[PDB]
Structure formats: structure tokens, C-alpha cells
Design a protein around this ligand. Structure first.
Ligand code: SF4
Ligand code: SF4
Ligand code: FES
Ligand code: FES
Ligand SMILES: [Fe+2]
Ligand SMILES: [Fe+2]
Lengths: 633, 633
């Protein structure tokens, strides 16, 4: 089982699934091999009913699509549609939150409110919305209206791009025509230009993809902004992760998917329903997280993380998961079938994301507490049905310190320099105690032994004094392997990095260091890393493409991860991807994405499937940036 | 060559291409065989980087996608993305025209103007925009703003759906949640819900597809509306079609793609440049049409149609095509390479639709006449370069009567009944002189011998007294085979239909009948057929799903044709498709689309590749509708 996952809790549940005859994602992958080499390389097109078309990577015919589309075109069009799809998921998430904020301050959804007034005012200021002498509700209405307005063309470009990046970066992007006009506008334009008989120039197509990736960034940033207003900006919190956070004697409820509009209310209502749970013979309701919505409630409330991404089915295999409450994205639809075996009640809540065989309980923000209680009573009933059945919860968990929003990192740093909080971090980049910064992002992928790339690359970077931050299921991987426990600083960190983490933590009264890796939140909260990096660029008076900052989507899966990787490149970062995206069938497209885009945005992809080699390449990219700043390395 | 195309002009050029060693679309198709059976059946997914996934239609593993996606889900998701792509092309086209109208009436694009004031006022009235005591420019600004507003969520649904269908049809759709909230909103929601780990219920997915298809209808209707305001509503016109419309002694310029914003100006400027052409030794500039933009200028100005769809490369093979002026959609990118052999100057004009190797001359509506002159001087220069080279223009053309907008059909009918113009048509449906109405729509497809399905089905329906209307390259197929020449009424039409066409034509002073098939315009002008059918429904006091009206996408290719077929079903029509869409890998999805959708919208797909059998099935669908109205059949 170590060939499937490096997580021992997952390994134990894989053994249970095997002896019970429950098919898993790894089993479905084995049954798919060998995968199609046309799809793997990107040399397949189904954009019209003359298809399917393919192109042999090498050899004889077919060499070109039926309409004349070259390998360059076909590869670029497929990639662009993946970017648009990722941007779309983020569009739905951010729009969901904008409409919730609007309903809240209009009196239409009393379960929701302005929780972070300071965040609201700062966002208003950044956007140019007046606040002096205005009521909070009015300010919030204006911020929500501005959010919705960024989805379509208007007299300004997308403000959740142009107001979040330094002017010099906006200028570089503008000169290449890359600033998005509207989020859903760009998505639609990608779908148009990639349809048959439209754009058929690889460079042109890929420039369109870069612009659409900035529409994805806007959606991520908007999502973080609005979720902080509604639910609170994260601050440092302590919790636990891995399957051992499940409790046989409690009603175990996983929140899975993405939007805190749902999960945040599940958490608060679960506490209100403690005595009912107890009446049912449980100790209470134990809410646990899976995937990004789990990260959201981990970051804000310390809700323990059960599992992530590829291993999500394993929570069910314990026999103790009473309910799995879903909104959208990254949910293996297998969960609905596995539930029939395990007893778990799988509940969908959003009209556009249903799964055949799952119970659907519409969740309306207008009725959020009522709808949550209906959902949680299904969970309590399920708990009662497993009275006396043995369960197998691996007794495996890690300690996790998390909650490192950008505000929280700045506050922590301010204990070393009150009126110039970024300066202690920069001082230590300059003196070499901090070599650079690496953001780990994105998914696990069944092709890669689960977490192996994240932990292999992170260990090499930490020993080389890189400040490592993480989001999404990258953060999930690292937390499940102890990278968020300050007790592991001595083992994992280089001496320079250890000194910095210790100095910050001691200044924050911890008696101890910050954790080895800073958890910056969900996948939309990759936008928090952008805020931190943009703040550093502005403090230094340089653009992002001069900073010793890199990203790694070390085990990427979703279209959303493709979009995030692409905007990381577009804003100026060297960006590793540890799985093959479907580009290798076109050398000209690969050369664009890994080399000549440097001349456009300063960023570039690093495609490298071997994690030791990836770590070396990421260090070389950091050190090249250090040399460009005149720094030792 | 008759196995490739049933068009003798195309056959002649296929012989020329063969002896000159010029690869064609048919050659590229042969080189693609056998095509992938996973793609053909829809049983392939590339929606994440764990893919590509496939499912064996029959036999053993693989049976399910890696994430657990079933065949039902995979097929429905792929279909939905094709619908969204089609809607996107129509979004770009309609938005292009809305922005042009806005610029025109703001003084920013003087080459454009309100040409159809009556159309402007009628659209304003339909939308609920006041006109009394307003200036035209102000009314037009409001119509343009309303058009743009339909792309995003607002306080009303998409008005280019809800104001163009009868209230009872809107009510049926509303009850199923199918009215679109915004055009680009729906496109993005499709891309989201079809991304990994989101919607995974076939019925739910397909309902989303029906709603997105209505966003495509809205874009089509908006495109027709705005193009009529700007360029004039079509009225009956006489012209010619097929390759023989090219003239060796003229500068031959094809307009190809879709938007009349470009082609309409090319036509007017070409006339202004006649003496320059002559100075260059040509007789003048001979503008000819390809694909929908050709249909646009055919319908409004009588510009002759050179060719359509799959045979577009053959215009170049004559050696006489001096320029091919492109905007977007349905342009085989092979044209850029073939031009190197033939001498033709291929010119792109839109930032989102470039072709490697083609000359790009940006076209700005603000500078339309200047930009058109630059384009046309490239064409004149090309003419001069072929002085003394032999050309091979097949001396093959047909007469075409066209220009049958809905307004034009109503006006023609009003000569028989001035104050109840639809009544003569209904009278003849009732007495059986008109059995029903069939709309032919959509593309040619290289899999089908070009035009064979359109002409085979049309001949059977016309002998059975069906009133046949056509758009796009369906209209193209029929016009190239003589179905738009009134001289062929005796041969083609049943006696009842002949009597009706004769009576209308004689009442309109023609001395002769209307043509066998009524050309209702470009593919967006499928919306004109909707206007006619909705007007008939309202006059009769019934919904569209009770009328003896059908549609046939007899040789469909583009994603746009998939979208149009799907909204034809959604508004209540039996809708034939004569090529296999990638659905056969899921029986449950096929059963939805061909049978149980009848219980939702009253419409349904008829998938039938044999055209004689298709004609029988279309007649049975018409006759079932007649029986439901209590009529003989
Ligand atoms: S768009 Fe071109 S390459 Fe793609 S399926 Fe259609 S003919 Fe083939
Ligand atoms: S979304 Fe599911 S079926 Fe599609 S490629 Fe990814 S794992 Fe395979
Ligand atoms: S030929 Fe396998 S992905 Fe299309
Ligand atoms: S396996 Fe051929 S279309 Fe994917
Ligand atoms: Fe996520
Ligand atoms: Fe068209």
C-alpha cells in the first residue's frame, strides 16, 4: 500500500477496503492502465463532430486535425479550456459568497453577517469605495456589487486583478493585453476562441490563456476577501489532522467541497445540536474537514482535518463517518456508491452539483440554520444505526498549527518590527537565513504515491532555509506528515530558517518557534500568498519577477490547479508542476510555457516529475532570483 | 469524387487539388481513419490530470472513470461543454454587434448607423424600453445596454429568451428551472459543474445543458436583432451561388466567418474602390460569400455565395481567389497553408482569431472604412500578381432567391390577407396543402458526402407538401443544388405546396411562385425561424410543442450546431441530427435526449444517419403533431 499512499492511516484503510471488496480510486486507476497516449500528450481534439481527431506524437499519419488544426493549436486549445474551467469553478465560488454578503446586509439571510469589519473597510479602501460617514451595511453592499460587477465588461477592468497587484506588474500585463475585462467574459471568450475554426495561432491562444488565468486569480482573491468579511480573517490556531480525528462515540460529520457559506454554518449549528446528539447516545457532533471547505473551517475555527483529495474515500471506510456534507468541486462521485457499503449518509446541497444515489437537501442561505439542522438530523439518525458495529479508525493523527493569513503573518512579524513588519523577513532573506519562499499548492493525483512529491520537495527546501507556505491539499499533505507541528522544526529546518521561526515565535510569546510550514489556507487562499508577495514587492520597490519566490503544484489534478499554476506564471513566478499536463505533444507550446513566457511575464513553468530533481530546479530558480538582486546564495 | 461531395463544382476542384498535390479536408479525414471509438461514443474524459479516462462501450474494464464518474456522467459532461462552447461563439458574435451599435450612436464609429429604425422601435417595444418622445440614438443606446446586460445576472432573467417565446412556453421552462440567468453566467456555470468532482447526475447535468442552450438562443436572437438594426432587415433578393460566381477578370474577395460588422463594410467599401481596381487592370472587386458572413451579405445585398462549410478550401483551388477576409468561427485553419500554394491572401481581423501564416490586419469599427481599404488593397495587389496565370473556375452556378426574414414572410403572406397575414399559412396547414414546416440548419460534415443528407431529406419532404425553410450551410447546400430557384418548383414540390407557393408569389407580383425553400439567413438567423414559429403559436393559442414544425441539423459539425439543436428541442421541436453526437456510449443519456425530454419540453432529438429513414421519421413527427391538432394527415 505504500506504493499508493505514503500516509499510514490511508494504507490501513486501503487494507480494509481490499479485504471488504470496496473498489477505490487506486483500483479504478489500475483498471484504466495503460492510459491513452494521445490524451496524455494533448494530441486529441473533440471540438467538433468531425472528430475525434488525434495526432501521432511521432511517426506517420495522422499528422494534423481534419480541419487543419496543428498539434500546436490542438494542445493550446485544450489547455485554454482547462484554464477556463478552473476559472469557472472559482467564478461560482466567489459569486456564491458575493450573493451571500449582499443577502446578509439586505436583511435576507440573518444567519450571515459582517464578522470582520476591519477587512471590510480595507477592501473598500483598496477598491476605491468611500467609507467615511457610511454605514457598514452600505459599504458591504457596495463591495458585493463591485464583486458581481467584475464578472462582466464595464468601464473598468477586473478590479480584483488591477487593485491587488503592484502598478508595475499591472503595466507589464496591460502592455501584453493580459488584464481581464470581466471574469465570465474571459471564460466565454476562451470557449469561443477554442471552438472549431477560430483561433489557430499557439502564441495567441496561450496569451488568451494567461489572461483567463488572471480571471481565475480574481475569483480566488474575491473568494478569500468575501469569506474573511463574512466568517473572519484567520489567525493562528492549533488543531489535529488525519483519520484519527474521527471518534467512534461521536456523530462524525465531514464537510467536503469548497464553500464556507455551507461549512461555517454546519460548524456553528453542530455546537447548538450537542444535546440532541447526546440524547441519541453520542458524545456530541464531531465535525471534521475534507478538502478546501475543511481547510476553511480549520483556518477559522480549528476544526480538525480528516483527509484530503485522492484519499477522501478512506474516511468512509473506517465505518464511523455518519455523514458527508457536500457543496461542489473535488468530490469523487464514487462516494455515493461507497456509502451504500459503509452506511455513511452523503448529502448534496447545491442545485448544480448532485450525485446519483446521494440524498439532496437544498441549502438556502435564507434558511441556513434550518437547512443545517435538517442535514445534521440525518447524521444523528445514521449514528444511531451503527450502534454496536465495530469501526476501524486508525489511531493516527498529527498536531497542526495553522491560521497564517497574510494579516496574521504581518502581525507575527510586527512583534519584531512594529512599524515595518515586512522588514524582518526581508532582512533574513538578505542575510541568507531565509533563502527564498516556496508556495506548495494544489491536489494529490492518483498517478503519484500520495504526498510523496510534497514531502520530498519540502524536506529538501526546508534544509536549504526556504520559507515554505502551503495551501489546499498541499497544506493537507504537509500537515498529515507533521510539517505543521513546531516540535519538528529541529529535525526539518536548516539552521537559518530555524533561527527565524524561533525568533518570530518567541516574540509572539510561544516559548517556541512557528511551525516548519505556514498554512495559508484553502485553494482560493492562494490569493493570500499573492497578497504577501505583492506586499514584499511593493516594500522592496521591485516587481514579483525579481523576488526569490517560487510555487509548486507538486501533485496537481484539477483544472483549478492548472488555472492557479498559470496565474502564478503570469504574475511572475517560477512555477513547478509535478505531474505532466497534456502539453508534451507540442514542443512549440512546451517551449512557450517553460521558456519564452519568461520574456512576457517573467514567470515560467518547471515541468518535473522526479521530486528530488524538482527540488533542485526550484532551488536553482530561487538562487537565480537571489543573484539578480545582488544577494549571496 | 462523388463520394466526397455531391456538388459538381467541388468535384472538379477536388480533381485539381489531387493533381496539384494539395491536401484537402477529405484527405485529412482519410488519414484520421479509423477514428477513436471512445471519442466517437462519448466515453472519454480529460477533465483532470488523472486522465485521460475512457470507458469500454462493451466488455470488461475500464468501466468507470478514475474519480468514479460513470458513463452517464462523462457523456453528459462532454455534451454540456459542447453546448457551452456553441453558446460562447454566439455570445462573442452578439456582444460584438452590441458594442458596435453602442459605439455608433455615441459618435465613436461613424461607418455604422441605425439603418432599420422600424426594427429598432419594435425591439425596444418588445423589451419594454420606452420610445415615445425619445431620440432614436437614445433608444438604440438603451437597446445596446439591455443586450449587454443579458450577459450577466441582474434583476430580470435573460430578456432575449423571456421576451421572444410565448408566455406559456416561458412558464413550462421556468417550472423546470431552465430560463437562463445571464448568457456568460450560464456558460461559466456549465464549465464549473462539468469540472471534476462537481455535478454527477445525468438528468441534472442535462437540464443544465438545456438551460445553457437557451443562452445560445438568446445570443442568436440578439445577433439577428442587432444586425438588422445596423445593416437592414432582409427582404427578397435574387442572386447566384457556387464557384462559378468567381470571375477571372475581377479581384475576387471572399468574406468568410460570421459577423456582418466586418463583411457589410467590405461590401460597401468594395464599391467605392471600383476605379482603383480598374486602374490595376481588373474589371472591379467581386465580393463573394463563404459560410455565415456570406449568408449575411447575400440576405441583405444579394452578394453571391461562393461555397460553404466543408468545401471552403475549393474556392482557393480555382486560382482566382485573391483574398479571403476572416473574422471568426468555422474557418478551416488549413486555408493559411493552402494559400501558400494558390496565391490567395488570407487576412485575419479579430484579436481572438488568428491563424499562423495569415496576414493580420486589425479591424476596428472606429476605423472601419480605413481598415477595409487597407484589406482591399492587399487583395488588388494579389490580383496583379496573377496576371497571366490560368485559373480554373468551374462554370457552375445556380440562381438563388433569398432574403426571407420573418418580416418578409409576413409581408409576402399579407398580400393574401392584409390584417391577418399568418392566417393564409395556417389555412393551408389545416387543409393539408402545407403538411408542416421543416427548418434545415447547420453545417456540412466530412463524414457525410457533402449535401447528400440535406438534398435527400428535402426532396422527400417537399414532395409531401412540407414548407421547407433553411439557414446557414443548410441553406448553402440547398441553394447550390437549385432549391432556391423558383424554376424548380414544378419538379420538386408536391401539388399542395406548389399551389401555396404560386398563390403567394402571384400575389406578390412575381408571375411565378416563391422558391421551393425559403432562405431565412445565417445561423444566428435560426432565431428568425423561432420568431415565425412563436408567432404561429401565439396566433393559434397553443405552445410550440403542438405545432407541426420540425428541425433537421442534417450534416451537423460545429459546437454551435449542437447548441442550436439543443435549444430547438428545449423550445418544443422534434429535432433531427444526421451525424452521431458523442452520446451513444450512454443509453440513459440517449434515452433522455431522444425520449424522456418529451415530458419536460415537448421536443426531442431524432438521431438518424440514413437520410431516407430520417425523412420518414421527420414526416412521422409532423404527422403526429397534425393528429394532435385534430387535423387529417
Ligand atoms: S475542431 Fe478540427 S481537430 Fe478538432 S475535432 Fe473538429 S476537425 Fe478535428
Ligand atoms: S474528471 Fe474523473 S473521469 Fe475525468 S479525467 Fe479526471 S478522474 Fe478521469
Ligand atoms: S484518442 Fe484518447 S484522449 Fe482522444
Ligand atoms: S481515448 Fe480517444 S477520444 Fe480519448
Ligand atoms: Fe480545493
Ligand atoms: Fe455559421
Amino acid at each position: 500500500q505504500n506504493l499508493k499512499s505514503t500516509d499510514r492511516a490511508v494504507q490501513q484503510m486501503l487494507d480494509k477496503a481490499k479485504r471488504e471488496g470496496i473498489q477505490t480510486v487506486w483500483d479504478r486507476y489500475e483498471a484504466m492502465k495503460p492510459q491513452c497516449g494521445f490524451g496524455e500528450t494533448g494530441l486529441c481534439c473533440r471540438h467538433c463532430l468531425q472528430g475525434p481527431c488525434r495526432i501521432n506524437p511521432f511517426g506517420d499519419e495522422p499528422k494534423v486535425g481534419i480541419c487543419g488544426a496543428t498539434a500546436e493549436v490542438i494542445v493550446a486549445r485544450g489547455l485554454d479550456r482547462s484554464i477556463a474551467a478552473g476559472a469557472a469553478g472559482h467564478s461560482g465560488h466567489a459569486k456564491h459568497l458575493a450573493h451571500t454578503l449582499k443577502k446578509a446586509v439586505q436583511g435576507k439571510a440573518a444567519s450571515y453577517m459582517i464578522k470582520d469589519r476591519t477587512k471590510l473597510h480595507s477592501i473598500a479602501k483598496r477598491l476605491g469605495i468611500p467609507t467615511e460617514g457610511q454605514k457598514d451595511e452600505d459599504i458591504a453592499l457596495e463591495v458585493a456589487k463591485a464583486a458581481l460587477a467584475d464578472f462582466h465588461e464595464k468601464d473598468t477592468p477586473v478590479l480584483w486583478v488591477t487593485t491587488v497587484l503592484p502598478p508595475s506588474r499591472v503595466k507589464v500585463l496591460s502592455a501584453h493585453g493580459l488584464i481581464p475585462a470581466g471574469i465570465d467574459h474571459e471564460i466565454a471568450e476562451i470557449m469561443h476562441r477554442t471552438s472549431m475554426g477560430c483561433d489557430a495561432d499557439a502564441q495567441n491562444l496561450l496569451l488568451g490563456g494567461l489572461r483567463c488565468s488572471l480571471a481565475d486569480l480574481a475569483g480566488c482573491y474575491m473568494g478569500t476577501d468575501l469569506a474573511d468579511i463574512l466568517f473572519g480573517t484567520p489567525a493562528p490556531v492549533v488543531t489535529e489532522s488525519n483519520l484519527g480525528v474521527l471518534k467512534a462515540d461521536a456523530v462524525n460529520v465531514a464537510v467536503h467541497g469548497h464553500n464556507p457559506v455551507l461549512s461555517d454554518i454546519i460548524v456553528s449549528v453542530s455546537k447548538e445540536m450537542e444535546n440532541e446528539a447526546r440524547a441519541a447516545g453520542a458524545t456530541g457532533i464531531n465535525v471534521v474537514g475534507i478538502c478546501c471547505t475543511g481547510n476553511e473551517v480549520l483556518m477559522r475555527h480549528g476544526i480538525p482535518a480528516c483527509t484530503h483529495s485522492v484519499s477522501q474515500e478512506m474516511a468512509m471506510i473506517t465505518g464511523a463517518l455518519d455523514a458527508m456534507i457536500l457543496d461542489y468541486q473535488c468530490i469523487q462521485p464514487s462516494v455515493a456508491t461507497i456509502a451504500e457499503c459503509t452506511g455513511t449518509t452523503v448529502i448534496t446541497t447545491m442545485e448544480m452539483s448532485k450525485i446519483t444515489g446521494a440524498t439532496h437537501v437544498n441549502f438556502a442561505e435564507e434558511a441556513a440554520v434550518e437547512n443545517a439542522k435538517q442535514i445534521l438530523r440525518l447524521a444523528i439518525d445514521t449514528f444511531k444505526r451503527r450502534k454496536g458495529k465495530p469501526v476501524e479508525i486508525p489511531n493516527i493523527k498529527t498536531k497542526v498549527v495553522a491560521g497564517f493569513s497574510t494579516e496574521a503573518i504581518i502581525n507575527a512579524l510586527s512583534k519584531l518590527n512594529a512599524n515595518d513588519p515586512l522588514k524582518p523577513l526581508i532582512d533574513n532573506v538578505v542575510n541568507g537565513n531565509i533563502r527564498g519562499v516556496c508556495l506548495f499548492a494544489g491536489c494529490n493525483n492518483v498517478k503519484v504515491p500520495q504526498d510523496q512529491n510534497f514531502t520530498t520537495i519540502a524536506r529538501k527546501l526546508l534544509k536549504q532555509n526556504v520559507l515554505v507556505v502551503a495551501t489546499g491539499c498541499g497544506a493537507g499533505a504537509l500537515m498529515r506528515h507533521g510539517f505543521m507541528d513546531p516540535a519538528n522544526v529541529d529535525e526539518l529546518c536548516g539552521d537559518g530558517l530555524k533561527a527565524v521561526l524561533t525568533a518570530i515565535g518567541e516574540a509572539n510569546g510561544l516559548g517556541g518557534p512557528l511551525p516548519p510550514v505556514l498554512h495559508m489556507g484553502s485553494c482560493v487562499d492562494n490569493s493570500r500568498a499573492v497578497a504577501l508577495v505583492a506586499a514584499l514587492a511593493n516594500r522592496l520597490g521591485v516587481d514579483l519577477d525579481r523576488l526569490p519566490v517560487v510555487a509548486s503544484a507538486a501533485e496537481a489534478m484539477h483544472e483549478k490547479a492548472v488555472a492557479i499554476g498559470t496565474w502564478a506564471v503570469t504574475i511572475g513566478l517560477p512555477t513547478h508542476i509535478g505531474v505532466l499536463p497534456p502539453i508534451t505533444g507540442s514542443l512549440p507550446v512546451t517551449q512557450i510555457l517553460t521558456s519564452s513566457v519568461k520574456d512576457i511575464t517573467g514567470g515560467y513553468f518547471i515541468v518535473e516529475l522526479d521530486p528530488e530533481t524538482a527540488a533542485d530546479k526550484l532551488l536553482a530558480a530561487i538562487n537565480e532570483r537571489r543573484a539578480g538582486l545582488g544577494l549571496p546564495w
